[PDB]
């Protein structure tokens, strides 16, 4: 019955904005919407995000959240298949913030299916042996996370170290030993008591119907679990860890299966200011191809050799992901040797490398979106980061024309070199299963307790939203 | 009755420490112990912190914790007062972090009494109209908070702005529509389920019986609700906001009831290093007594005029608490006149002012304890700051005499002058019934850094 008869192209209105305007503001929500002037398809996107304090408070309620959403989709799957067969997709997910919803598909039963979804996960029930299966099965899925590759495992540690609070997978694993069904069933409406939704809607609908869809949703919520709005003091975000301005810190973990060591080499530059975006992007492209040329290809270090930027929590970063069978400090030494190699390779730049390199950076950055799902994921990725500066492109290109090469030495010396007063250097080791000239770098620290590490450490500011 | 026999003094053993030693640490509890050397009295004092995550999660949980301990007090008072009549006093209070337990008295029957206290506050019930009276009563105490003294108002807004997270009393007012018996009754076993203990045992007592009784206690905690210990990553604390090194920010708060304008003038110095404690104490006192000369008598600001230190989250601070009925910028201007007065009053110091002053500080600081509860309260006051620097006294005094006139000049300039690079100044205006602006305190606190914490010794 989910077959469409809605094939009607809606003519664009007097409201000819090129970017989504805040058409509805409450103390409950915040709603962003655009429609496709170019693409012309009867499809739409939906990226509802539930926001709650109680999501990441502990291992225990987070465990209940994951098992909840698991049995939630598991119940509503048998209905969902006909929509999924028709080109009507959805996704329930959890975040550090709350639970994550992303629907995408056609323009047919959009308010209707969404009404059903919201009303179903609003008032939801649990079966017994179903709960036993979700418990046992994800419990079996837990200790598999010892076994993955150390580049993945290391990136898990990267998002571990570079946040405010972070639960490891062991403690989260152990906390399911006591999870019974009445505790969850008591927990659920308390979770559902208060929460926030902030959504991006994109595709073949109108403004007023979007206002009705949003009203619909929040009214459905107030109808079921009597949700009341939040106050703007519990719009928290997580901060990120300061480094003590000259330190190079590292520690190691050890995998059992793989006979390979991994590494990820983090660098805190700065927040995304107008200078730092083009600085780090330009540096990223100039460290893109020669690292692939000399380290992985020419020096034959390994196969999982990765280099480049890191952008998380409104913070720029530079990282180097390398899994191989090497001593990691040996590996560090050749990383630093490559740094010297690049350092010398800076001053050797002509105006052709310069101009072709920045034009290739421009065309790497500049491209108009082809699929509507792509641009929505980019815009969404900026809405979750609360930046919203959609006209960063003009910003970046206008800044880009004002760069020199000596600026990147000015970028290099205090931030990236070894004789740096402003040195923000950090690596991460991951041991193997059983465990051409470098100068003497300063000594690292051992890190026994990551908590006692982060105990006395400052926290970064957050970003002024555009 | 409770066997009032054993008032004997116990002689000091091989553990001849003058300061409380950490005799037990687990992930469940953490236990410090100290026999009485100086007084030798037949008494004992006990202080207990029960650390638990559920404390400052939301204004609703805080109200429930409040009402829990509040009605808990109302429940046990009727049982407890006749034993209190026997000469064993106590206090139950709360922390923003956890619960505060005081057990004070003789050595004879604190194990049996505290046993029954734990058994009592474990198994807890609610009466209906009792809940309504206490609810209404604290509801009165809450919307009363429009009508109190502006020095308390100023300290409340300062502890709002200069912490990490802070729930206002307005939110607390509005949220009381939802406090139902089943909701609290669901909340209660969840709270007591999983928590951390911390305890001070001080008096003529032993270490081994202290361990066995404490063990017994936490075993009873496990006996009721299958208590499990907390994880050592959720012993977090809230940090304090780092000013961006130059800012002088201000805003206003309008009182409704009192036709009085409070004002608190905050200054971030630094964390408590051993130098900074004596910097701040000595400089505080050097601006103390001439302020007694000039403020009430000469400048005639008001009658409730206060200045001085701030001890919070391991971070020092400087304040000027003044409640009066004034224009706040006018009042700021005469505070700045007092700042000029103390600034030249530094440079006009003789050796005599210096020497009498540091001896004043010395006798100000130096005193032997006079009761086990006093020293025990100071030690507890150190355990709540998790510092444990038991002989900071002797070190700080030994440092204290090693100061010069020029030592506080170099302390003065970078933080306090008008052309100052480290000037961390911020005031709070409380109005009567009649820089940058701060629109949203969340959006204010959005892009400002956070201070580190203290390395535990």
């Amino acid at each position: 019955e989910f077959i469409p008869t809605n094939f009607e192209i809606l003519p664009l209105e007097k409201e000819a904005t090129p970017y989504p305007a805040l058409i509805k503001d409450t103390a409950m929500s915040k709603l962003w919407f655009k429609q496709d002037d170019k693409f012309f398809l009867p499809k739409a996107n939906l990226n509802f995000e539930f926001f709650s304090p109680f999501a990441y408070v502990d291992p225990l309620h987070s465990n209940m959240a994951y098992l909840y959403l698991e049995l939630l989709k598991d119940s509503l799957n048998e209905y969902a298949y006909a929509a999924e067969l028709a080109g009507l997709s959805y996704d329930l997910q959890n975040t550090i913030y709350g639970m994550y919803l992303s629907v995408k598909g056609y323009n047919d039963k959009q308010p209707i299916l969404l009404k059903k979804i919201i009303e179903k996960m609003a008032t939801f029930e649990i079966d017994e042996k179903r709960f036993e299966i979700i418990k046992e099965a994800y419990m079996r899925s837990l200790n598999n996370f010892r076994a993955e590759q150390p580049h993945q495992h290391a990136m898990y540690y990267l998002r571990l170290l570079m946040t405010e609070v972070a639960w490891t997978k062991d403690e989260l694993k152990e906390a399911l030993d006591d999870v019974t069904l009445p505790r969850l069933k008591a927990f659920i409406p308390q979770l559902l008591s208060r929460l926030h939704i902030e959504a991006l809607l994109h595709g073949n609908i109108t403004k007023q119907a979007a206002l009705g869809i949003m009203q619909m949703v929040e009214d459905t919520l107030i109808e079921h679990a009597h949700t009341k709005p939040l106050l703007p003091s519990q719009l928290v975000r997580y901060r990120e860890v300061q480094l003590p301005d000259r330190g190079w810190f590292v520690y190691q973990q050890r995998n059992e299966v793989h006979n390979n060591s991994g590494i990820e080499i983090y660098y805190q530059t700065d927040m995304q200011s107008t200078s730092e975006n083009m600085f780090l992007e330009l540096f990223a492209q100039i460290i893109s191809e020669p690292a692939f040329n000399t380290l992985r290809t020419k020096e034959q270090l390994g196969y999982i050799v990765f280099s480049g930027p890191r952008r998380a929590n409104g913070i720029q970063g530079l990282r180097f992901i390398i899994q191989s069978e090497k001593p990691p400090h040996y590996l560090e030494s050749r990383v630093e040797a490559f740094l010297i190699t690049m350092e010398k390779s800076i001053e050797d730049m002509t105006e052709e490398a310069f101009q072709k390199h920045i034009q290739a950076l421009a065309i790497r950055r500049l491209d108009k979106p082809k699929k509507l799902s792509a641009e929505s994921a980019k815009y969404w990725g900026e809405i979750i980061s609360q930046q919203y500066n959609f006209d960063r492109d003009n910003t970046e290109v206008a800044y880009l024309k004002t760069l020199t090469k000596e600026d990147i030495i000015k970028f290099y010396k205090e931030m990236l070199a070894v004789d740096a007063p402003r040195r923000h250097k950090v690596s991460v080791h991951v041991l193997a299963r059983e465990m051409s000239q470098a100068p003497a770098l300063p000594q690292p620290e051992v890190i026994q307790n990551m908590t006692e590490f982060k105990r006395g450490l400052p926290l970064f500011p957050l970003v002024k939203p555009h």
Side-chain angles (χ1 to χ4, degrees), chain A residues 426-445:
Chain A
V426 51
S427 293
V428 169
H429 296 169
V430 170
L431 300 177
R433 60 185 292 167
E434 295 297 325
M435 300 179 183
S436 296
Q437 182 177 0
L441 274 67
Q443 290 299 110
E445 71 182 2

Side-chain angles (χ1 to χ4, degrees), chain A residues 8 25 58 81 113 136 173 182 205 218 243 258 274 296 317 342 353 381 417 440:
Chain A
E8 295 83 7
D25 192 3
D58 58 347
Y81 177 76
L113 180 61
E136 196 272 335
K173 178 179 173 66
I205 50 173
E218 53 86 20
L243 290 177
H258 299 100
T274 312
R296 171 250 178 76
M342 281 328 280

